[PDB]
Write an enzyme that holds these catalytic residues in place. Structure first.
Site, PDB file in Angstrom:
ATOM      1  N   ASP A  24      10.641  11.053  14.038  1.00  0.00           N
ATOM      2  CA  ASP A  24       9.594  10.354  13.307  1.00  0.00           C
ATOM      3  C   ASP A  24       9.625   8.862  13.655  1.00  0.00           C
ATOM      4  O   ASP A  24      10.581   8.358  14.251  1.00  0.00           O
ATOM      5  CB  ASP A  24       9.763  10.582  11.803  1.00  0.00           C
TER       6      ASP A  24
HETATM    7  C1  LIG Z   1      19.003  -1.709  -0.550  1.00  0.00           C
HETATM    8  C2  LIG Z   1      17.524  -2.050  -0.377  1.00  0.00           C
HETATM    9  C3  LIG Z   1      16.725  -0.776  -0.111  1.00  0.00           C
HETATM   10  C4  LIG Z   1      15.229  -1.056  -0.223  1.00  0.00           C
HETATM   11  C5  LIG Z   1      14.506   0.253  -0.522  1.00  0.00           C
HETATM   12  C6  LIG Z   1      13.030   0.129  -0.163  1.00  0.00           C
HETATM   13  C7  LIG Z   1      12.385   1.503  -0.308  1.00  0.00           C
HETATM   14  C8  LIG Z   1      10.880   1.360  -0.132  1.00  0.00           C
HETATM   15  C9  LIG Z   1      10.203   2.698  -0.405  1.00  0.00           C
HETATM   16  C10 LIG Z   1       8.686   2.525  -0.299  1.00  0.00           C
HETATM   17  C11 LIG Z   1       8.083   3.758   0.366  1.00  0.00           C
HETATM   18  C12 LIG Z   1       6.726   3.409   0.974  1.00  0.00           C
HETATM   19  O1  LIG Z   1       6.440   2.277   1.185  1.00  0.00           O
HETATM   20  S1  LIG Z   1       5.539   4.718   1.391  1.00  0.00           S
HETATM   21  C13 LIG Z   1       4.157   3.907   2.247  1.00  0.00           C
HETATM   22  C14 LIG Z   1       2.873   4.686   1.991  1.00  0.00           C
HETATM   23  N1  LIG Z   1       3.107   6.094   2.232  1.00  0.00           N
HETATM   24  C15 LIG Z   1       2.321   6.812   3.210  1.00  0.00           C
HETATM   25  O2  LIG Z   1       2.518   7.965   3.381  1.00  0.00           O
HETATM   26  C16 LIG Z   1       1.265   6.076   4.026  1.00  0.00           C
HETATM   27  C17 LIG Z   1       1.236   6.647   5.431  1.00  0.00           C
HETATM   28  N2  LIG Z   1       2.398   7.513   5.548  1.00  0.00           N
HETATM   29  C18 LIG Z   1       2.898   8.005   6.817  1.00  0.00           C
HETATM   30  O3  LIG Z   1       2.354   7.719   7.829  1.00  0.00           O
HETATM   31  C19 LIG Z   1       4.138   8.903   6.817  1.00  0.00           C
HETATM   32  O4  LIG Z   1       4.247   9.516   5.563  1.00  0.00           O
HETATM   33  C20 LIG Z   1       5.406   8.092   7.087  1.00  0.00           C
HETATM   34  C21 LIG Z   1       6.625   8.994   6.905  1.00  0.00           C
HETATM   35  C22 LIG Z   1       5.518   6.936   6.100  1.00  0.00           C
HETATM   36  C23 LIG Z   1       5.396   7.542   8.511  1.00  0.00           C
HETATM   37  O5  LIG Z   1       5.252   6.149   8.473  1.00  0.00           O
HETATM   38  P1  LIG Z   1       4.215   5.447   9.545  1.00  0.00           P
HETATM   39  O6  LIG Z   1       3.026   4.888   8.805  1.00  0.00           O
HETATM   40  O7  LIG Z   1       4.921   4.320  10.251  1.00  0.00           O
HETATM   41  O8  LIG Z   1       3.750   6.466  10.558  1.00  0.00           O
END
Ligand SMILES: CCCCCCCCCCCC(=O)SCCNC(=O)CCNC(=O)[C@H](O)C(C)(C)COP(=O)(O)O
Ligand SMILES: NC(=O)C1=CN([C@@H]2O[C@H](COP(=O)(O)OP(=O)(O)OC[C@H]3O[C@@H](n4cnc5c(N)ncnc54)[C@H](OP(=O)(O)O)[C@@H]3O)[C@@H](O)[C@H]2O)C=CC1
Lengths: 395, 127, 216, 84, 39, 134, 347, 60
Positions: D41
């Site tokens: 991925d």
């Molecule tokens: C110790 C500190 C740790 C910090 C923790 C931070 C955790 C942050 C968690 C927030 C999660 C998000 O943002 S989720 C962001 C929005 N989610 C989405 O699904 C939008 C498009 N998604 C996709 O394309 C695929 O699912 C994907 C697998 C994401 C591929 O990433 P790419 O788009 O590149 O291809």
């Protein structure tokens, strides 16, 4: 071909934790300082967020009055007063004159204790401890009046929709009048120790300077406005009770420094004494709560002798009154500034939305602008003049 | 000044993940987590945190989720949250999962939940 | 403008007659006629300033909020120099759930105005901090409690809720008690968060009457 | 332009590529697209680049991350760069 | 059935003037931030 | 109002008053009548950019005309202050504050609306009016 | 993961809730030695899951203060006056209890209590009292790994004799035999550190040859829970050794390394010399009260138990039978406590 | 108290007797600035003031 000039960098991102000679409550303050001078202040709040606003939504209107007493532990009466005024506006309920007088009287009393605590705790933060102890005896005398009217020294819950919970006990007006006969002399004693003192002057003059434009921009109210030259008082500009009858003068200063606001608060105590004397002399006779028994509880003999009064008592102490659909924002001149409640009603027996407008929230927001270029020691004084209460800031 | 010779964000989450990975050593040093956990080990947890929100496809919801994840990173980076918070919420569960030994249950998923509790939707603590 | 103290004695008046009339009965019509594109509907109702008077409520769309606020602050006749507070109300029955409410003061007019922007979870509201510096914390609180995003905010961060809180508590779909609870563990010498358990559950008492009519 | 031997850097990059769960089994060599051959991925690709960051003490531009696509491309990028 | 002829008038009118943007089903639940097992 | 300074000063001096209440913070200039006239005329020149048949421009013209009249009959600068309920300095700052929002109003052009524009207005009727009498 | 019941009779009726603090677990426990290092964690594990724990303690309100926080209202019952020689109090303590855990032990002798009393007489007397009741379903006794009848040290010999007596009276009792337990309040690493830092010389018996299998306190506490959640464990002795077997010299060296001591302060106090230096001091101990200056380390019994290999027998039950993977005691969270002292970037 | 033997709530019911009327405003019709500034004072003598309300409404 002309040389450029470089600059300097700031570090020392200190964390100023909960600290006892400061405004009461828990304050977490992150300060960025260039050397011994502060460049940014970021107050961290939420340490006393009890979810009050959402809890109100699950309670009936009369069940939610004690929340406002505990929002600000220094000034309870002013805090519950705005809530009862907003419910009265939506309900279209008229308060009898005796109850209006009792509300104005006790509002002025809580104003006086608030100013006493503010000034003497500010002096304690500076480092003078005698005015502080000299003040607790007065504050005890006023807490004794509260325990007489309500049975609770701090969280009275005395103000109710349409009037007051109970009538003034016999002999109270004489006692309040005696406390008033001696209050001015006590205040003068406190004023000599603070006012005219070179160390106090040096600590407070030209510290925390605010201008009128800055105060309106940041939404400040009360002593902060009046120490800068703004002749704005809700009790006069937007009267809410028999305050319109009352005769008193707004205290005004122009510099905006810490000293000017201290002088304003002392003069405010004196003006409140004048208002109390007028209340005592002109106290009317008659009903203290609204005659309508569909919004106010019936008297105990009346519930015990009448069927309609027992029905009204049962349905007011189980369901509560139904407030007509509508929205209102009612503000009162609290000792710390302007305290307002934005109440949204959909027609039920519980509030749908009760937003609380904190006077101290905007002052804590103003902290950063005010405490720029100051020192670590000046922060305590600046916090003292804001007089912020964090249960009041964090609802 | 001219010659003919002279002139001749679908992946917002990827950028946020890159920001988290690049900022990881700083939070390791700020939160004194060097000895307890490795950088790669934390880099592994961050992906699972990202993968939980995969199903969404709307751009606006994606924007909100990214802003919230940036907030989560900023809390650790700016020392809003503390060392024990990092231990409790990330490092400890990941280490616990590695140390876990379990017997492969011959009973199907239904039988195990039936033996456990009447209402499967209610959570279990200290499993 | 700024109510700088001018009159030393006999300022008993609440305000002048003309200033009161222009704001008692012409204020909404004046606003609608002067800046028609911004306004969608107007409500005159019980006054915020007082019981006896009437104060306006203006409904505007998120795109026009910044220009409407700038007009309200600096127009010569209407000088709402102060932002009292910013608030949101959640209406789950509506498609556009959130109603962002702005409360303003004109010291010169001695009047209060209420401005409402109706949005949903995905849409954002432009920040008005440049118009009023007090907005910053109020919009941060609105973001924390209700989840309304404010565009071009200098730094939109949560204020009231605990660090690591992801839910928005004042949303009507959020449980009153929340989802988690905090306890100290002896084994791990840390204060930890766990799923909620209640020794005594909150008792909701349904007091509604069939015969009541005030409920809308 | 190869600052250090091609065989060494390739063996090292494929060693880190093996560490990822998949990207192995029958085909772990050159000419293998990360997302179209190895099942990786995009986040896994970024993490793999960060692991190569730790191995060879040199950073990768994000726009270059948009440009990198293959096992050949990553080793080419690391051999090209003088810090290596 | 006739009309309430009160604040509900402006309430309904605010409803009909304004509207919400369409999103895919379940997307808002992720924005809510509550535990996903709630859904 | 009441001064909170123990020192004795004269508030009828009409300059000691301004120094005490801090009008100098608003503007370091003295704020004479001629400055007010100039500011009002500059506002009138500025609002020329707004279209002629625009309600906002008519409003600014009417307000500026009213204030130029109030300057007209009143030869005393203090009299203008009494009629307008303001210090001359803040009256002058008022027109500049109006000048500040002209660019923002010329970017969105609020006055452009269709010839069928209709803004619904809901008004509250109090029961005290009906119950007491009709 | 699926929560496994506490395998106690009629638990299915009483149990209710998710298994947390406010839930109801059908276990009422009398943990003797609750205020001790081992006992406190066992109380925490049992009470964490909504069970009720009765904690008999010798009068000391400040020592039993942490146990107050352990459970919800009415779950942790603290009985004020515990005496090992008082039968009636023991009967009252286990009146409502269906499981009894005995963690009562003394590292050293005193004038009031000897090894034979605490480690032999109390287990036998308590075993008879538990046997006569019948309500008690599970019995767990905590002992050392090196405990043997043919052991030079009096402590480890008396412990094994008491365990045999317990096995005689209650045949279904489980004998938990952990190694040197590492924890924040442990007596292993804390005593070693105090020896390295606030003692003139650190005497090491022989050259540190003796092998040990230290285990973390949370692992033993979890092992107790796994014993109680399985009835098939009854009647069996479990040697809860740690994941790694280490010589004492390695542990001393690694403590010196983690604390970043300047150099090695340990000396070679070989055996046959400690047996002459501490032999009179044992007679000194048996006639004097508890004194902080000398204890545990400064005894002939400690030298005798540090000349043998306290390791699990090859054929034996352990953590694997309980499906627990023990955590390493030389790395990770286990070693954080010594790490806070000094790591060379510290002070 | 004149309510002892004379009971009539519908005459004294202000809570449920409030209503909201509706109007429509259009930009075509010009605003009346004569109303706003025709009544405005041009000299100090003509200034008229609104006094502060002494008491809030009560039933008596
Ligand atoms: C110790 C500190 C740790 C910090 C923790 C931070 C955790 C942050 C968690 C927030 C999660 C998000 O943002 S989720 C962001 C929005 N989610 C989405 O699904 C939008 C498009 N998604 C996709 O394309 C695929 O699912 C994907 C697998 C994401 C591929 O990433 P790419 O788009 O590149 O291809
Ligand atoms: N290194 C370890 O910790 C290991 C411990 N064990 C065994 O586990 C048991 C306890 O471990 P630990 O908790 O470390 O030892 P502790 O001494 O820390 O706990 C001893 C408990 O027994 C009580 N106790 C001791 N003597 C008496 C007495 N005469 N009358 C009443 N109560 C008494 C103590 O109460 P008070 O505080 O009032 O004495 C204390 O609560 C011991 O038998 C030990 O051998 C097993 C493996 C390793």
């Amino acid at each position: 071909m002309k040389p450029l000039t470089p600059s300097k960098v700031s570090n020392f991102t200190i964390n100023f934790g909960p600290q006892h000679p400061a405004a009461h409550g828990v304050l977490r303050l992150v300060l960025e300082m260039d050397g011994e001078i502060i460049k940014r202040a970021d107050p961290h709040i939420g340490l006393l967020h009890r979810g009050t606003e959402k809890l109100l939504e699950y309670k009936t209107y009369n069940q939610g009055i004690p929340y406002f007493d505990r929002l600000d532990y220094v000034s309870m009466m002013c805090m519950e007063h705005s809530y009862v005024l907003a419910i009265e506006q939506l309900l279209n309920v008229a308060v009898p004159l005796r109850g209006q007088y009792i509300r104005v009287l006790f509002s002025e009393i809580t104003r006086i204790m608030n100013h006493i605590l503010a000034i003497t705790c500010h002096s304690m933060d500076v480092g003078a401890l005698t005015p502080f102890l000299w003040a607790f005896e007065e504050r005890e005398k006023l807490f004794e009046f509260y325990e007489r009217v309500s049975g609770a020294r701090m969280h009275a819950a005395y103000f109710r929709v349409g009037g007051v919970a109970q009538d003034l006990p016999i002999g109270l007006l004489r006692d309040i009048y005696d406390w008033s006969r001696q209050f001015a002399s006590r205040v003068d004693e406190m004023e000599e120790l603070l006012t005219g003192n070179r160390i106090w002057k040096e600590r407070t003059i030209d510290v925390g300077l605010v201008t009128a434009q800055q105060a309106w921009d940041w939404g400040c109210s009360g002593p902060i406005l009046r120490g800068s030259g703004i002749d704005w008082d809700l009790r006069k500009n937007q009267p809410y009770d028999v305050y319109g009858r009352m005769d008193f003068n707004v205290p005004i200063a122009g510099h905006g420094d810490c000293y000017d606001r201290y002088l304003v608060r002392v003069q405010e105590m004196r003006e409140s004494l004048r208002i109390i004397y007028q209340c005592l002399n002109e106290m009317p006779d008659g009903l203290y709560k609204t005659p309508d028994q569909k919004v106010s509880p019936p008297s105990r003999g009346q519930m015990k002798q009448s069927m309609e009064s027992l029905i009204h008592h049962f349905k007011l102490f189980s369901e509560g009154y139904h407030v007509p659909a509508g929205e209102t924002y009612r503000a009162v001149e609290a000792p710390k500034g302007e305290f307002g409640v934005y109440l949204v009603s959909r027609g039920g027996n519980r509030p749908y939305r009760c937003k609380i407008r904190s006077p101290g929230y905007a002052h804590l927001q103003m902290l950063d602008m005010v405490a720029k270029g100051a020192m670590l020691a000046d922060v305590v004084t600046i916090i003292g003049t804001l007089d912020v209460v964090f249960g009041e800031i964090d609802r | 000044m001219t010659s003919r010779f002279a002139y001749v964000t679908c992946q917002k989450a990827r950028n946020l993940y890159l920001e988290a990975c690049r900022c990881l050593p700083f939070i390791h040093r700020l939160h004194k987590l060097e000895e307890i956990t490795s950088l790669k080990e934390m880099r592994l947890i961050i992906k699972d945190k990202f993968r939980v929100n995969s199903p969404v496809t709307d751009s606006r919801v994606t924007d909100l989720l990214i802003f919230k994840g940036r907030e989560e990173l900023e809390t650790y980076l700016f020392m809003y949250k503390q060392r024990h918070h990092a231990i409790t919420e990330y490092i400890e569960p990941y280490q616990i999962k590695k140390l876990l030994i379990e017997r492969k249950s011959s009973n199907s998923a239904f039988l195990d939940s039936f033996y456990e509790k009447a209402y499967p939707l209610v959570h279990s603590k200290y499993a | 403008s700024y109510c700088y103290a001018r009159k030393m004695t006999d300022k008993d008046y609440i305000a002048y007659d003309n200033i009161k009339n222009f704001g008692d009965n012409y204020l909404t019509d004046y606003i609608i006629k002067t800046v028609p594109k911004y306004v969608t509907m107007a409500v005159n109702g019980p006054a915020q300033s007082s019981v006896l008077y009437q104060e306006p409520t203006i409904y505007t769309t998120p795109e026009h909020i910044y220009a409407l606020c700038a007009f309200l602050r600096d127009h010569v006749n209407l000088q709402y120099k102060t932002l009292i507070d910013i608030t949101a109300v959640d209406y789950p029955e509506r498609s556009a759930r959130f109603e962002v409410v702005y409360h303003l003061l004109s010291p010169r007019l001695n009047n209060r105005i209420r401005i409402k922007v109706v949005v949903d979870e995905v849409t954002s509201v432009p920040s008005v901090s440049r118009i009023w510096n007090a907005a910053n914390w109020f919009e941060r609180e609105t973001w924390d409690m209700f989840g309304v995003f404010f565009s071009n905010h200098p730094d939109l961060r949560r204020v009231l809720t605990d660090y690591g809180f992801t839910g928005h508590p004042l949303r009507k779909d959020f449980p009153l008690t929340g989802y988690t609870e905090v306890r100290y563990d002896y084994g791990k010498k840390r204060v930890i968060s766990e799923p909620l358990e209640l020794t005594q559950e909150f008792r909701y008492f349904d007091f509604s009457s069939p015969w009541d009519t005030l409920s809308r | 332009s190869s600052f250090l031997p091609k065989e060494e850097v390739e063996s090292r990059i494929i060693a880190q590529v093996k560490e990822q769960n998949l990207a192995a089994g029958i085909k772990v060599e050159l000419s293998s697209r990360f997302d179209k051959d190895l099942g990786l991925d995009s986040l896994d690709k970024v993490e793999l680049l960060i692991s190569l960051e730790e191995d060879f003490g040199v950073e990768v531009p994000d726009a270059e991350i948009d440009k990198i696509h293959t096992v050949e491309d990553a080793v080419n990028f690391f051999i090209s760069n003088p810090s290596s | 059935a006739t009309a309430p002829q009160d604040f509900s008038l402006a309430m309904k009118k605010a409803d009909e003037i304004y509207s919400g943007k369409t999103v895919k089903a379940g997307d808002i639940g992720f924005s809510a931030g509550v535990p996903l097992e709630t859904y | 109002f009441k001064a909170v300074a123990d020192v004795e000063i004269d508030f009828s001096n009409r300059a000691v008053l301004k120094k005490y209440v801090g009008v100098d913070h608003l503007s370091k200039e003295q704020g004479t009548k001629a400055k007010f006239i100039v500011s009002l005329n500059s506002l009138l020149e500025a609002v020329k950019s707004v279209p002629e048949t625009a309600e906002y421009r008519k409003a600014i013209e009417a307000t500026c005309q009213y204030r130029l009249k109030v300057c007209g009959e009143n030869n005393s600068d203090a009299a203008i202050e009494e009629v307008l309920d303001a210090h001359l300095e803040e009256l002058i700052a008022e027109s500049k504050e109006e000048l500040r929002i002209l660019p923002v109003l010329l970017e969105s052009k609020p006055w452009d609306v269709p010839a069928d524009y209709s803004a619904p207005v809901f008004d509250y009727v109090d029961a005290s009016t009906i119950l007491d009498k009709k | 993961s699926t929560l496994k019941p506490f395998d106690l009779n009629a638990n299915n009726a009483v149990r209710n809730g998710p298994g947390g603090r406010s839930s109801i677990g059908g276990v009422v426990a009398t943990v003797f030695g609750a205020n001790g290092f081992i006992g406190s964690y066992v109380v925490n594990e049992i009470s964490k899951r909504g069970n009720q724990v009765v904690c008999p303690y010798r009068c000391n309100e400040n020592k039993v203060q942490p146990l107050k926080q352990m459970g919800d209202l009415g779950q942790v019952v603290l009985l004020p006056e515990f005496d090992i020689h008082d039968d009636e109090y023991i009967r009252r303590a286990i009146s409502r209890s269906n499981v009894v855990i005995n963690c009562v032990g003394i590292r050293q002798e005193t004038k009031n209590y000897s090894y034979k009393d605490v480690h032999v007489d109390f287990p036998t007397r308590l075993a008879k009292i538990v046997a006569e009741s019948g309500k008690v379903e599970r019995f767990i006794q905590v002992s050392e790994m090196g405990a043997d009848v043919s052991h030079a040290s009096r402590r480890l010999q008396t412990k094994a004799v008491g365990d045999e007596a317990i096995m005689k009276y209650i045949p279904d009792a489980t004998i938990i035999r952990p190694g040197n337990v590492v924890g924040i309040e442990d007596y292993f690493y804390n005593n070693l550190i105090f020896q390295l830092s606030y003692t003139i010389v650190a005497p090491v018996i022989n050259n540190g040859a003796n092998k040990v299998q230290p285990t973390y306190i949370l692992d033993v506490a979890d092992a107790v829970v796994k014993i109680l959640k399985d009835k098939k464990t009854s009647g069996k002795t479990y040697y809860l050794g740690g994941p790694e077997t280490l010589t004492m010299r390695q542990i001393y060296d690694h403590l010196i390394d983690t604390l970043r001591l300047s150099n090695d302060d340990t000396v070679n106090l070989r055996y046959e010399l400690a047996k002459m230096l501490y032999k009179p001091l044992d007679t000194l101990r048996t006639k004097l009260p508890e004194f902080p200056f000398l204890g545990f380390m400064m005894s002939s019994d400690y030298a005798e138990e540090q000349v043998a290999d306290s390791v699990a027998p090859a054929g034996s039950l352990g953590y694997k039978d309980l499906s627990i993977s023990p955590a390493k005691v030389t790395e990770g969270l286990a070693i954080e406590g010594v790490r806070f002292i000094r790591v060379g970037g510290y002070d | 108290p004149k309510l002892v033997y004379d009971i009539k709530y519908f005459a004294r019911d202000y809570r449920r007797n409030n209503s909201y009327t509706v109007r429509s405003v259009d930009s075509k019709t010009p605003f009346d600035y004569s109303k706003v500034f025709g009544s405005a004072p041009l000299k100090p003598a003509d200034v008229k003031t609104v006094r502060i309300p002494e008491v809030m409404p009560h039933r008596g």
